[PDB]
Amino acid sequence: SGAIYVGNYRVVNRHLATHNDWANLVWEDSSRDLLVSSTTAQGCDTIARCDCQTGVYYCSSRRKHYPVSFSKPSLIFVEASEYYPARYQSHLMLAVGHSEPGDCGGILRCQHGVVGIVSTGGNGLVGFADVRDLLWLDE
Numbered sequence: 001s002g003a004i005y006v007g008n009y010r011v012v013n014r015h016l017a018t019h020n021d022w023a024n025l026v027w028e029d030s031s032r033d034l035l036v037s038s039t040t041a042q043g044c045d046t047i048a049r050c051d052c053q054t055g056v057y058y059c060s061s062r063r064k065h066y067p068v069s070f071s072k073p074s075l076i077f078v079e080a081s082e083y084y085p086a087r088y089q090s091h092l093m094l095a096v097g098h099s100e101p102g103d104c105g106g107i108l109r110c111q112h113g114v115v116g117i118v119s120t121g122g123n124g125l126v127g128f129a130d131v132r133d134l135l136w137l138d139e
């Protein structure tokens with residue numbers, strides 16, 4: 001679990017979004033596994049605007065932060081689940097590192113701020129949904 005709170009927005013994995021999130025929907029994209037909902041309180045997370053390929057992510061299944069080199073956002077095939085059929089998830093970045101399903105929502109950060117959130121994993125790999133291109137989260 002986990003979310004990004006920036007201004008009046010909450011960013012979560014679309015597969016983990018609650019009834020509240022859907023009832024206060026701003027934007028959702030199944031192909032990215034992202035959903036943004038409106039909030040009443042202020043969010044102070046800073047979103048990174050960059051092309052960094054190194055950062056640190058939070059891994060709840062280990063209660064630890066790990067440094068990673070990750071790939072540029074791209075279309076990567078994702079195996080079927082109780083949330084989605086087999087498909088290409090876009091805006092996805094992979095890194096070598098530990099992850100388990102409950103790790104989704106853990107934040108990936110670089111020196112410039114929040115980069116994305118854990119969305120996929122398996123076989124010694126961890127996949128992050130990029131949020132750096134969503135420039136509207138700041139205005």
Ligand SMILES: Cc1cccc(NC(=O)N2CCC[C@H](C(N)=O)C2)c1
Nearest residue numbers: 033081099100101103119120121122
């Ligand atoms: C982080 C992690 C580790 C091991 C396994 C998983 N499950 C995973 O990748 N799935 C199921 C949940 C929805 C994901 C998706 N974005 O389509 C696909 C996650």
Ligand SMILES: [Zn+2]
Nearest residue numbers: 050052110112
């Ligand atoms: Zn950066």
